[PDB]
């Protein structure tokens, strides 16, 4: 038994930050002060963007059914789900379509059998086994077990298989599993491009998450994914502070009872000028690039270990206007919503797809993933006409460079960093798992419940 903490800072009003605030509240009780910093708008990558009067998801867009944190949250917050359908889908290689979906599902079955055989089925079954192991996390989190390291977490779910996938490229992985060069370049690679704007040179684990994201049932939050952030924030009853955190420094206190412990001074800038406050615990729920969150770490002993890592640029470009169906090879096209690309370096886009707005109400609204800002020439070559154009540059996810070691969860004595998780998978639910885990870990670390940390073979014992 020990003194419960007075103040906790959470840096970042992301889905990660606000999820932390929520779970912290659940572990430390109503008493503890929780402050969430946000230099920008709540939601971070779950922003929207106004296009001819309506809001569209510009960052985090869809949510899988096995995203239980987001499911439980939308339920608890009483938000509505925009579980819509989609449309038609094709893969372009820079000459023609290696594959196009038909209106008859049986046609599609036939096409995919001829072109790929059972590889469609076999990937499914390989992915299910990965997912199935991964779902163990919920049971462990519902029983409050924590993990000090993204690797250790994965190990606890899938054992060595999962830690080896992290160090493998999803290409290596699927070749070792006997998937064909054809299927890898025609199916798998486009999926990587659309999802993570990178090729099959990304973490096997990320990649398998990616491939479940072609599973069906998908949905989004009606009104914006970013509502989930503000909704949790409210429901956690944390104090939201608009300011760009600049610096974080250890100090020593003096508990009335002659204490001598280590606090963290967080300095942040606002309109008015500089301001600061002292915290017993810190959770960083933003990436630690100097381009993404300029926090300086002062007088630490020992120094925070190396989270130095780089994210990948993806530009979401929205266009109200009609496509150039002839730029993909149609001439007189009888009658055609999403185009994915193969890894052809003559292409300048990752994907291009008609979108619906967040609210629920040709020449329509399109969404273009590109590595770089689209030039006038490329917009013109892309669309016949366009009334309006909107574009956000998004350090969106890691530049997965396997083999590599995920950034720590523990930066210091009582300072935790959840965005390490991205290097296993960048997704909404992944931020939620990390936040949950980060909260548990901090709690167990504060109260010294070492029986609850880094416990292996949990699933067996927890299994009936
Ligand atoms: C283009 C795109 C598409 C995506 N599509 C999907 C998808 O289809 N499905 C899915 O599940 N996920 C998707 N994601 C991921 C989704 O956005 C998740 O939210 C993501 O894993 C975490 O992003 P975040 O900013 O919400 O969280 P975090 O990165 O954990 O939160 C970062 C927060 O910290 C704040 N911050 C930064 N610096 C400071 C500072 N100095 N002081 C205070 N606050 C600071 C930021 O403003 C932000 O709010 C997508 C992301 C992008 C960019
Ligand atoms: C349990 C015991 C045998 C396991 C299967 C085998 O391992 C073969 C194969 C390995 C892939 O990796 C994932 C898919 C597949 C079909 C496994 C699925 C699952 O795990 C099984 C059924």
Author numbering: 26 to 361, 364 to 388, 398 to 500
Authors' description from the paper:
PCYOX1 contains a non-covalently bound flavin and metabolizes free prenylcysteine into cysteine, an isoprenoid aldehyde, and a stoichiometric amount of hydrogen peroxide.
As they show high sequence identities with their human counterparts (78% and 88%, respectively) they were selected for experimental characterization as models to understand the human proteins. Reflecting its high stability and operability, PCYOX1 could be crystallized, and its structure was solved at 3.1 Å resolution using AlphaFold2-predicted coordinates as a search model. The FAD prosthetic group is bound to the Rossmann fold in an extended conformation. Beside this overall similarity, PCYOX1 is distinguished by the presence of a wide and elongated tunnel-shaped cavity extending orthogonally from the flavin ring to the protein surface. Computational docking predicts that the substrate binds with the isoprenoid tail extended along the cavity towards its entrance. However, a large hydrophobic patch is located on the underside of the enzyme. An electron density peak on this surface region convincingly matches the shape of the sterolic head of CHAPS, the detergent used for crystallization. This region likely represents the site of association of PCYOX1 to the membrane and may act synergistically with the KTEL C-terminal sequence to retain the protein in the endoplasmic reticulum. Notably, the entrance to the substrate binding cavity is adjacent to this hydrophobic patch.
